[PDB]
Design a protein around this ligand. Structure first.
Ligand code: TRP
Ligand code: K
Ligand code: K
Ligand code: K
Ligand code: K
Ligand code: K
Ligand code: K
Ligand code: K
Ligand code: K
Ligand code: K
Ligand code: K
Ligand code: K
Ligand code: K
Ligand code: K
Ligand code: K
Ligand code: K
Ligand code: K
Ligand code: K
Ligand code: K
Ligand code: K
Ligand code: K
Ligand code: K
Ligand code: K
Ligand code: K
Ligand code: K
Ligand code: K
Ligand code: K
Ligand code: K
Ligand code: K
Ligand code: K
Ligand code: K
Ligand code: K
Ligand code: K
Ligand code: K
Ligand code: MG
Ligand code: MG
Ligand code: MG
Ligand code: MG
Ligand code: MG
Ligand code: MG
Ligand code: MG
Ligand code: MG
Ligand code: MG
Ligand code: MG
Ligand code: MG
Ligand code: MG
Ligand code: MG
Ligand code: MG
Ligand code: MG
Ligand code: MG
Ligand code: MG
Ligand code: MG
Ligand code: MG
Ligand code: MG
Ligand code: MG
Ligand code: MG
Ligand code: MG
Ligand code: MG
Ligand code: MG
Ligand code: MG
Ligand code: MG
Ligand code: MG
Ligand code: MG
Ligand code: MG
Ligand code: MG
Ligand code: MG
Ligand code: MG
Ligand code: MG
Ligand code: MG
Ligand code: MG
Ligand code: MG
Ligand code: MG
Ligand code: MG
Ligand code: MG
Ligand code: MG
Ligand code: MG
Ligand code: MG
Ligand code: MG
Ligand code: MG
Ligand code: MG
Ligand code: MG
Ligand code: MG
Ligand code: MG
Ligand code: MG
Ligand code: MG
Ligand code: MG
Ligand code: MG
Ligand code: MG
Ligand code: MG
Ligand code: MG
Ligand code: MG
Ligand code: MG
Ligand code: MG
Ligand code: MG
Ligand code: MG
Ligand code: MG
Ligand code: MG
Ligand code: MG
Ligand code: MG
Ligand code: MG
Lengths: 123, 209, 114, 56, 118, 17
RNA sequence: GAUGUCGGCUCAUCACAUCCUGGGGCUGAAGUAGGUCCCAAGGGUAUGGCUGUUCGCCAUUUAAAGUGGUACGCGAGCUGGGUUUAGAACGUCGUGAGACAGUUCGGUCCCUAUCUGCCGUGGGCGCUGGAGAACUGAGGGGGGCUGCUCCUAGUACGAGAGGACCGGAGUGGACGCAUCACUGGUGUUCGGGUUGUCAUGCCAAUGGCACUGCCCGGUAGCUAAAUGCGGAAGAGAUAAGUGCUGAAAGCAUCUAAGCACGAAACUUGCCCCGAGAUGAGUUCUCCCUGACCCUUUAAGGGUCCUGAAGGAACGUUGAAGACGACGACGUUGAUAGGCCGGGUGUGUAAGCGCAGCGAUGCGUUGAGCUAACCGGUACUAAUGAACCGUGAGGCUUAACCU
RNA sequence: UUCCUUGUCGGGUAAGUUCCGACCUGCACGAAUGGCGUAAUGAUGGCCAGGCUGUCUCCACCCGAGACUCAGUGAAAUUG
RNA sequence: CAGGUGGUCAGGUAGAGAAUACCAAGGCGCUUGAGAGAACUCGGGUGAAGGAACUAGGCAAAAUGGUGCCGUAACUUCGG
RNA sequence: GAGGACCGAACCGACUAAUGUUGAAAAAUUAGCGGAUGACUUGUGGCUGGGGGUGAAAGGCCAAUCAAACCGGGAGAUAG
């Protein structure tokens, strides 16, 4: 459940630490972005010599939320914070080469199969 | 095709072997007794009239009791009608049970909603509320404007205002039939149907696809 | 409602073990990676239990890869293959929600031992 | 808000067409005292449905 | 909405209602018949009748449980010595409501509530 | 008696300068 | 002898000179994508930064971010930033009091709705003997939005780059209706922890007050962020447009006679209201089968006997409800409370014993307590009556039996 | 105090008519109707950040006092 | 008639205290009540995920809050 | 043990919001807010009188009245 002005942690090694969602893509008057949704972000904090710098406007995919995901039997999987993975603006491919922390099986698509492969754990 | 009169028992789940839980509404469909058949010669249209359930013999009036005795059935809790298609035939006294829906895949369920009483415009029509702060004066959930000015100088018909909500007839369409159990007179539809627990339901086949 | 409680009694599992909040439990769930089917283990502390018959559930919290993960299991789900208790915990409460703000040595749970 | 014209004595009697009281019709007799009372109420003498319930 | 709820607010707050039915329950045990309004007599059945079944088995833990709900040792002594033994073979229905006149000062509907063997 | 305050109040009364 | 101003909020409604979606002609239209004109108002038609702003510029979306009317819609619906009283200061003008569509800081927004209107909900009477039900449907209202991916197909087209029409499947956004099985919120009526103080003679155990004292969990109900469903297909008559046959006008020509296609617009199809539809409709069932007198002799009035079907009232009440209304039940009875059994929630009560100098721990013990839930049970309350409602239902004509 | 004007450049923001630093073309600053600075102080004006939050997305539930019904008393503005 | 009105007396437990909470002596329950548990208004409690996106403006709410000890920058009129 | 010193009750005040606006009140209530040994605050008495007083200056105040108080008179001022 991500919306505009939501601050997210970053779950890859691109160099960012905190990012802010500035638009939930994919429709007009669209409110929230769950796990597996592309968002438009801006970088609020970064490391001194990363691939990205503070103030960039990029895309990202949501991989963990405190609200959690729902499974067909009724189960829920929640986390402690919200995390995303940076993507390129045009090709929409990951920028980092490592993934930190678990991800879930909502990312299991042709679009994000590189995130599923690098992930330490898939729930 | 005709429908059946049931009763909402409640909701539960049905677990699938794939591990998918289906929310179902349990509808108790006892046998419906045909009490009158209407035709084009005498009534101008073709329909059957069914009764279901039971009734205390001290609560049955003499007018109602004579209408059941003429058919040869025992008094039920009410009377409902179903328009017949052409080619469907029934006789007075015939009993129709839940295996009518043995091969129907989707149904329409009609019931009376739950009553919410007098409801405001925020609950009834999804109006926006106004500011909770910033100087507002006794106007936190009021409707706002209801018209223009001198032209037209009146409020239009069908304006959305506060009033009685719920407690009316509602039809939910195209519900999947999960299970038809004839020995315990059950019918399991996927999803939620109008009404409280213990209400009357009219279950037809789906008109659409 | 004798009708609904009879429809639910025919779906309930018969050998779900006994566990209480504070216990360390390993649950094995069915995962489907395309076309094949396997079991994966979720091990943590039971922080909550819901007793509602067929609608029973229980929450399990664990720290995985540096991130806290809470998972609510539907007890009579056929996705849950088996539940097994690894350790018994001594707590005074029925809901251990105060363990969300604790971690490390502050989130240790005493063993019951009896 | 206040009226622009004085309503008539006819419009005042039309509004009060629903203000009438309805007399009670059910005065029941006690089967041992013969006293009248409201139904499901005790009598002035303390009887109810044939027996002395309150010794007042 | 109000669907499926029980209990009457009686135009009071939570602590006033609890203190009022604790005084009214001691007066019904003491005098064995009282006169009060009809809605208050109907809410009094859900306070005093649970106390009479608690007094049907005598123990130190039940005496202290009835004392925490009446706060009057004279009422607890009558519950466990007289009222308990009286109702020992009756399954509920210890009280009986009799409707009487309307009150003179405010036209409130009154009613007597007594014990069944008075 | 004194007049109604809203008839005194400059904001309400002097609305069309 | 007063018609409150700009902008914002809320709630809208109409026009069509159409922004998107739909249908077409021409193209300097290969395809994809456009340009321009014609038809079409069913639905839809952004969030933020700056500024009092409308506007505008910018950032990022979207199928699209339409143009206008409605006292530049809407202050007896809200605000009061701007403008527009009284204080004060700057620049400027004036000898000065003062002044400035120049700027700057501060600055009281009333109204209990009589009528029309609108949203809900009842009473009366009518509908031609009375009553209880089930209907027909004249008429009215609701709804109607759309993306992306895949297949067809890397096919048609094209030197390449690129890349379809038509048709089919899946999955979303926004919106709406219902519901509470799941995930949750609330849960001052359930359980527990704990601070200060007062009281119950005292210990132990409890209660009152301090925002529910502060907190931690939580039943039922209500509910969204939860999860089911919907927009259609089809038919009829068409718009712009396209035709077939065909004269006037030996040719040509969609038109003059005749015939066929054609769109989210129209009429239906889907959902809801609906016989006060005074044009008051239909079907089924139930009930009433007594005497006398008088006047002004007629759809006349009165008396005695009679009181039906049914209704209302009263009571116990409800997932129904502001009050009416609506639903269930009233002893031939589960309507409400209590009680019994269960479930659920909290989390191992009190008393006693043991260990410890003691706080405290352990055993008895998953104990005790447990609201609105589930299944049962006449213990308490739902009274024998009384009240209203009648006694065969006008005239004329026609068709039938006599 | 600057009309033109949201002047131009730099900082801060994804985006800044406000804010801070600078430039000087001061419509129409300027030296006791004082000029320029200035630690401390201010229920003073403008701007930014952290924390916090029903201010909002977008409202839901609950506790009380009214509103509603019954008994008693009983106004007002206005009005051809 | 929720306004105004000078002086004197000054108990207990906790507390720095004449603050505050609960009490003593003492004095009161405020001269309409009884029901119900709709919208809406007023005074409050709690709230999933987000956290100023609200708005002219963080208005209002939420939050901080005690004693002891450690530690504390620019600037300064040497006191802060 | 100084201070128009600091935090903070009584006491004096009146910065914000909400309510109220035919009010409980012809200026208040509730929650916050400022000063609180001083250019402080308060009781009782006294003095200054209307083109006059008094004014840490707002045309503020001078008995709910103030760019000239109130009462009586000129007075039936005058009113294209
Ligand atoms: N409106 C407020 C204040 C007020 C009193 N008198 C006024 C005269 C003019 C404007 C406002 C007022 C009141 O009635 O209490
Ligand atoms: K709604
Ligand atoms: K418009
Ligand atoms: K047109
Ligand atoms: K278009
Ligand atoms: K075209
Ligand atoms: K349209
Ligand atoms: K402008
Ligand atoms: K306005
Ligand atoms: K008006
Ligand atoms: K106003
Ligand atoms: K009128
Ligand atoms: K329509
Ligand atoms: K729950
Ligand atoms: K709940
Ligand atoms: K205590
Ligand atoms: K709490
Ligand atoms: K031709
Ligand atoms: K469509
Ligand atoms: K009719
Ligand atoms: K014990
Ligand atoms: K238990
Ligand atoms: K200047
Ligand atoms: K910048
Ligand atoms: K900039
Ligand atoms: K200076
Ligand atoms: K100040
Ligand atoms: K300052
Ligand atoms: K009510
Ligand atoms: K000193
Ligand atoms: K001192
Ligand atoms: K003095
Ligand atoms: K004078
Ligand atoms: K005077
Ligand atoms: Mg209603
Ligand atoms: Mg106001
Ligand atoms: Mg308010
Ligand atoms: Mg007109
Ligand atoms: Mg009252
Ligand atoms: Mg209290
Ligand atoms: Mg006039
Ligand atoms: Mg047009
Ligand atoms: Mg900002
Ligand atoms: Mg206007
Ligand atoms: Mg208006
Ligand atoms: Mg203001
Ligand atoms: Mg202003
Ligand atoms: Mg001035
Ligand atoms: Mg001017
Ligand atoms: Mg002010
Ligand atoms: Mg107003
Ligand atoms: Mg009226
Ligand atoms: Mg119709
Ligand atoms: Mg229609
Ligand atoms: Mg919960
Ligand atoms: Mg909670
Ligand atoms: Mg709680
Ligand atoms: Mg003790
Ligand atoms: Mg006390
Ligand atoms: Mg006290
Ligand atoms: Mg439930
Ligand atoms: Mg009819
Ligand atoms: Mg029985
Ligand atoms: Mg700049
Ligand atoms: Mg701003
Ligand atoms: Mg500057
Ligand atoms: Mg100067
Ligand atoms: Mg000068
Ligand atoms: Mg000079
Ligand atoms: Mg300076
Ligand atoms: Mg000062
Ligand atoms: Mg009255
Ligand atoms: Mg008058
Ligand atoms: Mg007048
Ligand atoms: Mg007084
Ligand atoms: Mg004083
Ligand atoms: Mg005090
Ligand atoms: Mg005393
Ligand atoms: Mg009731
Ligand atoms: Mg209330
Ligand atoms: Mg929240
Ligand atoms: Mg939270
Ligand atoms: Mg903003
Ligand atoms: Mg905004
Ligand atoms: Mg504030
Ligand atoms: Mg510093
Ligand atoms: Mg120093
Ligand atoms: Mg120092
Ligand atoms: Mg000082
Ligand atoms: Mg002053
Ligand atoms: Mg103030
Ligand atoms: Mg105050
Ligand atoms: Mg201070
Ligand atoms: Mg101070
Ligand atoms: Mg003070
Ligand atoms: Mg001094
Ligand atoms: Mg004065
Ligand atoms: Mg003069
Ligand atoms: Mg004169
Ligand atoms: Mg003269």
């Amino acid at each position: 459940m991500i919306q505009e002005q939501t601050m997210l942690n970053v779950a890859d090694n691109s160099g960012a630490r905190r990012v802010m969602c500035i638009k939930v893509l994919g429709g007009s008057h669209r409110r929230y972005a769950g796990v597996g949704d592309i968002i438009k972000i801006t970088i609020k904090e970064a490391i001194p010599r990363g691939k990205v710098k503070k103030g960039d406007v990029l895309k990202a995919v949501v991989v963990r939320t405190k609200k959690g995901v729902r499974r067909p039997d009724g189960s829920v999987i929640r986390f402690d914070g919200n995390a995303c993975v940076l993507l390129n603006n045009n090709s929409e491919q990951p920028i980092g080469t490592r993934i930190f922390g678990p991800v879930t099986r909502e990312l299991r698509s042709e679009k994000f199969m590189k995130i599923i492969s690098l992930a330490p754990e898939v729930l | 095709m005709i429908g059946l009169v049931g009763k909402k028992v409640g909701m539960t789940r049905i677990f699938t072997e794939d591990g998918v839980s289906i929310p179902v509404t349990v509808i108790e469909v006892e046998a419906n007794r045909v009490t009158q058949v209407k035709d084009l010669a005498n009534d101008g249209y073709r329909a059957i009239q069914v009764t279901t359930g039971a009734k205390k013999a001290n609560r049955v009036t003499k007018p109602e009791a004579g209408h059941f005795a003429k058919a040869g059935v025992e008094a039920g809790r009410g009377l409902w009608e179903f328009r017949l298609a052409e080619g469907e035939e029934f006789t007075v006294g015939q009993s129709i049970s839940v295996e009518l829906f043995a091969d129907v895949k989707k149904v329409d369920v009609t019931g009376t909603s739950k009553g919410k009483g007098f409801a405001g415009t925020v609950k009834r029509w999804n109006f926006r509320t106004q500011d909770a702060t910033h100087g507002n004066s006794l106007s936190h959930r009021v409707p706002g404007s209801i018209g223009q000015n001198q032209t037209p100088g009146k409020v239009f018909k069908g304006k959305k205002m506060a009033g009685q909500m719920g407690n009316e007839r509602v039809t939910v369409q195209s519900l999947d039939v999960v299970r038809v159990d004839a020995e315990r007179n059950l019918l399991l539809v996927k999803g939620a149907v109008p009404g409280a627990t213990g209400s009357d339901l009219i279950v037809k086949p789906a008109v659409k696809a | 409602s004798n009708i609904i409680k009879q429809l639910e009694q025919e779906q309930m599992k018969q050998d779900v073990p006994s566990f209480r909040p504070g216990d360390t439990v390993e649950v094995k769930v069915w995962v489907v990676e395309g076309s094949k089917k396997r079991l994966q283990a979720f091990e943590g502390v039971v922080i909550a239990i819901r007793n509602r018959g067929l609608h029973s559930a229980f929450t399990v919290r664990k720290i995985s890869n540096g991130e806290g993960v809470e998972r609510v299991f539907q007890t009579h789900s056929p996705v849950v293959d088996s539940i097994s208790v690894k350790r018994r915990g001594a707590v005074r409460k029925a809901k251990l929600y105060y363990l969300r703000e604790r971690t490390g040595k502050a989130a240790r749970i005493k063993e019951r031992l009896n | 808000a206040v009226q622009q014209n004085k309503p008539t004595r006819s419009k005042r009697g039309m509004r009060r067409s629903h203000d009438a009281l309805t007399a009670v019709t059910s005065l029941s007799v006690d089967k041992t005292s013969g006293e009248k009372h409201l139904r499901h109420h005790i009598t002035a003498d303390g009887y109810y449905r044939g027996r002395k319930v309150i010794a007042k | 909405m109000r669907h499926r709820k029980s209990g009457r607010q009686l135009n009071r707050n939570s602590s006033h209602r609890q203190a009022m039915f604790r005084n009214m329950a001691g007066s019904l045990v003491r005098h064995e018949i009282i006169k009060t309004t009809l809605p208050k007599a109907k809410e009094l059945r859900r306070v005093v009748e649970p106390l009479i079944t608690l007094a049907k088995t005598d123990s130190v833990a039940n005496r202290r449980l009835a004392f925490a709900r009446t706060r009057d040792n004279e009422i607890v002594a009558k519950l466990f010595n007289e009222l308990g033994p009286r109702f020992a073979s009756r399954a509920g229905g210890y009280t009986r409501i009799l409707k009487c006149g309307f009150r003179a000062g405010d036209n409130a509907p009154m009613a007597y509530i007594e014990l069944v063997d008075r | 008696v004194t007049s109604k305050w809203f008839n005194i109040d400059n904001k309400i009364v002097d609305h069309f300068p």
